[PDB]
Design a protein around this nucleic acid. Structure first.
Ligand SMILES: Nc1ccn([C@H]2C[C@H](O)[C@@H](COP(=O)(O)OP(=O)(O)OP(=O)(O)O)O2)c(=O)n1
Ligand SMILES: [Mg+2]
Ligand SMILES: [Mg+2]
Ligand SMILES: [Mg+2]
Length: 540
DNA sequence: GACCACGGCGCG
DNA sequence: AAAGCGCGCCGTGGTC
């Protein structure tokens, strides 16, 4: 179809490329092509050809940019049809689907990918015309953010490998102690990793009371919540919970991470997926660095393995109570606004009630426990679940939920208004106009409809917080480059940077200010910042 | 060796 | 498990 023309392509051409594997830091670049003006140009040798491009423009542009950075080439990502489609409808998350939906087919040939990028860009650009607010998000947030993400991905983070290896050996011995006790208590060995085998042991052999059922298959659940309720019924329960905690951490973090160090950089490299969530948040994968443990003693030990380069420090910055502040702005609730104008902390207040201690006596881990409670209740947690999680009577859980919303009267009104508009329009939106379609708001099945409602009224809050963080990253990145500091990770409302020791204090101050001032709301945004040699010490 | 669905669980 | 929401990865079980 397209006239095949000699490499290289003219400037502004759209690229297509094929990787040996999905991870750009680990992939071999198998093929590269570009398309423009009814022509397709195929590179005879992809790696060398990379040097001819001045911009990665096309589907998955960021990925190619990350591969280019890895090879020491400064090839920034530009237009990407994925970002246009994702803004039109965040269910647009794969090139396979976007292609089918907007005008072609995602194949495994670079030339075809190049032509496809060009055609999809034309069509999607046409769909965005008139959508002033989505276009603003594209130009002011998503497009420039992809460049920032590319640098983050290519930079990676330093990990204390020997430390994790040593930790693995210690945790293995403790796991053996736990499994042996579980087998002694069961009266026989079995695969303790199999929730099917454990189910039979707990509920059929030991005759414990089943408490809950699983979603898809209706099996008797062995979840931590069920085990928690059974803690008193049998000694084997506590041992299983401890085994579960250790094996989770070992199988997910301690063992896999050390093996993922890149041979060229000597660092660990995640992917920051820009078109992966329904709300506008980023996700992180291969490996996921947005869920590194932090709650338990062993989890904290693991977080300590994330460290600064010699002569550098980590700077960790985290928005205070962020979705509550966002909620205050979206809902306009006078009481909630006043909470933040007065410098109050709702997590600490709930924690002090939960644990029956003065606010001054609330420690960091008590405060963290209050977050599930505060956001749980806000986004529709049942009194039954609440009562179970707090080990208080059903009636007390009910009253806590009532006082919560009674304290902030306009919140319920905002929720109702949000749902009404979502029903009529078919979508809900963030402060900046990012959309999520929620068709099930009119489902005739109550459980399905109500589930859709909770998704719907949560999206403007979580999504607005996401837009704010993305905007802050776009503003902050060029200031960091100027100071010779690096942006390493984003964890939803937190950034982790790496700075030369002599500039770390200046970097911390500047980053705090950029993040707090990103987009003034009806309440102040506050950012907590710490500096340290490891990720744990840097969050104070 | 691969894929999936599921339950389960780590973080935000 | 339960009327929190958003993710990605683990091992098991079942295929292919
Ligand atoms: N169990 C949780 C924890 C967090 N979040 C969302 C809402 C939070 O505001 C946001 C950021 O998570 P944080 O842990 O940083 O919580 P906060 O910003 O609210 O409190 P903090 O002051 O400790 O940073 O993610 C959530 O929906 N459910
Ligand atoms: Mg926060
Ligand atoms: Mg946070
Ligand atoms: Mg799942």
């Amino acid at each position: 179809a397209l006239e095949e023309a000699p490499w290289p392509p003219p400037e502004g051409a759209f690229v297509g490329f094929v990787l040996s594997r999905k991870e750009p830091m680990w992939a071999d670049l198998l093929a590269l092509a570009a398309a423009r003006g009814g022509r397709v140009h195929r590179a005879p040798e992809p790696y060398k050809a990379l040097r001819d491009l001045k911009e990665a423009r096309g589907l998955l542009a960021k990925d190619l940019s990350v591969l280019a950075l890895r090879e020491g080439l400064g090839l920034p990502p530009g237009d990407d049809p994925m970002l246009l489609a994702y803004l039109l409808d965040p269910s647009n998350t794969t090139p396979e689907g976007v292609a089918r939906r907007y005008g072609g087919e995602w194949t495994e040939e670079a030339g075809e990918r190049a032509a496809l990028s060009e055609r999809l860009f034309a069509n999607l650009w046409g769909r965005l015309e008139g959508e002033e607010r989505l276009l603003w998000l594209y130009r002011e947030v998503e497009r420039p953010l992809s460049a920032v993400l590319a640098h983050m991905e290519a930079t990676g983070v330093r990990l204390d490998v020997a430390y994790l290896r040593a930790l693995s050996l210690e945790v293995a011995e403790e796991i053996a102690r736990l499994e042996a006790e579980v087998f002694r208590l069961a009266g026989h060995p079995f695969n303790l990793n199999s929730r099917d085998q454990l189910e039979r042991v707990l509920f059929d052999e030991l005759g414990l009371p089943a408490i809950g059922k699983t979603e898809k298959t209706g099996k008797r659940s062995t979840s931590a919540a069920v085990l928690e309720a059974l803690r008193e019924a049998h000694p084997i329960v506590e041992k299983i919970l401890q085994y579960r905690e250790l094996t989770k951490l070992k199988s997910t973090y301690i063992d896999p991470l050390p093996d993922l160090i890149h041979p060229r950089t000597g660092r660990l490299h995640t992917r920051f997926n820009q078109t992966a969530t329904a709300t506008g948040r980023l996700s992180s994968s291969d490996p996921n660095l947005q869920n590194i443990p932090v709650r338990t003693p062993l989890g904290q030990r693991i977080r300590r393995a994330f460290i600064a380069e010699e002569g550098w420090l980590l700077v960790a910055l985290d928005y205070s109570q962020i979705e509550l502040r966002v909620l205050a702005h979206l809902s306009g609730d006078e009481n909630l606004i006043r909470v933040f104008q007065e410098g109050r902390d709702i997590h600490t207040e709930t924690a002090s009630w939960m644990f029956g201690v003065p606010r001054e006596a609330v420690d960091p881990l008590m405060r963290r426990a209050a977050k599930t409670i505060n956001f749980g209740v806000l986004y529709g947690m049942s009194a039954h679940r609440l009562s179970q999680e707090l080990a208080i009577p059903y009636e007390e859980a009910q009253a806590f939920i009532e006082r919560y919303f009674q304290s902030f009267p306009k919140v319920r009104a905002w929720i109702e208004k949000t749902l009404e508009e979502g029903r009529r329009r078919g979508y809900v939106e963030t402060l900046f106009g990012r959309r999520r379609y929620v068709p099930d708001l009119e489902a005739r099945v109550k459980s399905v409809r109500e589930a859709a409602e909770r998704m719907a009224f949560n999206m403007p809050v979580q999504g607005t917080a996401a837009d704010l963080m993305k905007l802050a990253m776009v503003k902050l990145f060029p200031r960091l480059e100027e100071m010779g500091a690096r942006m390493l990770l984003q964890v939803h409302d937190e950034l982790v940077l790496e700075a030369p020791k002599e500039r770390a204090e200046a970097v911390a101050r500047l980053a705090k200010e950029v993040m707090e001032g990103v987009y003034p709301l009806a309440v102040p945004l506050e950012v907590e910042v710490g500096i340290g040699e490891d990720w744990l010490s840097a969050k104070e």
